Design a protein around this ligand. Sequence first.
Ligand SMILES: *[C@@H]1O[C@H](CO)[C@@H](O)[C@H](O)[C@H]1NC(C)=O
Ligand SMILES: [Cu+2]
Length: 235
Amino acid sequence: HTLVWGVWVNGVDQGDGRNIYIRSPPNNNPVKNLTSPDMTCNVDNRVVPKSVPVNAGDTLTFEWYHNTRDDDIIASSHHGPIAVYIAPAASNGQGNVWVKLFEDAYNVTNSTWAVDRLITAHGQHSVVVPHVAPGDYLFRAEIIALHEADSLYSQNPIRGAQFYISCAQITINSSDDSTPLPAGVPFPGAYTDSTPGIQFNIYTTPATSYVAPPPSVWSGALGGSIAQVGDASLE
Ligand SMILES: *[C@@H]1O[C@H](CO)[C@@H](O)[C@H](O)[C@H]1NC(C)=O
Ligand SMILES: [Cu+2]
């Protein structure tokens, strides 16, 4: 159970984004139905009034939270990977538009999942804005909690992979468009029962062998991290 409070750009807080530049759902409940239009941008996907201005090469930081800002972020139980996708705002998430910019599953050295490191990073993970066509965009942040993913939601609806999905409205102003956005995967659609990383037993399988759901990170992806860039408590 976790939600996006807002974003930082180049380490500067853009302010509370909820229902403003984040297409926020009403609560932090997970999406579990892989075929639901809810997989696109969660259960209240509608245009919101603001779009965050950024330039190619800027660091865009998602800030997640559980109940209040800078709290415990997401229950420690919710071990799993984090991905960020992008699609032109024109799509509104429909069709084969979502290009992956970031993937973090398990870090072997630290022996931590992406979610473990998200909590330490106070809900903050980042991507560098790629050299795509200036225009309006959706950045779709995705946390998969695997603590009930031994079962498939299609077979047993009270279990399954849990998706925490948040779409930020981002306007890329300044970019040379030297890496124009390629063909994307659809959501819903990219993830099925058969897809690697959807069904997994974190208790009996070693995390080292976890493979995260395709697609792979686009060659045009410019960087990303799970790491505090900003201190919310100083505001
Ligand atoms: C999952 O989503 C599909 C497509 O919208 C829907 O028809 C199906 O009823 C859903 N499954 C459940 C159990 O709600
Ligand atoms: Cu939860």
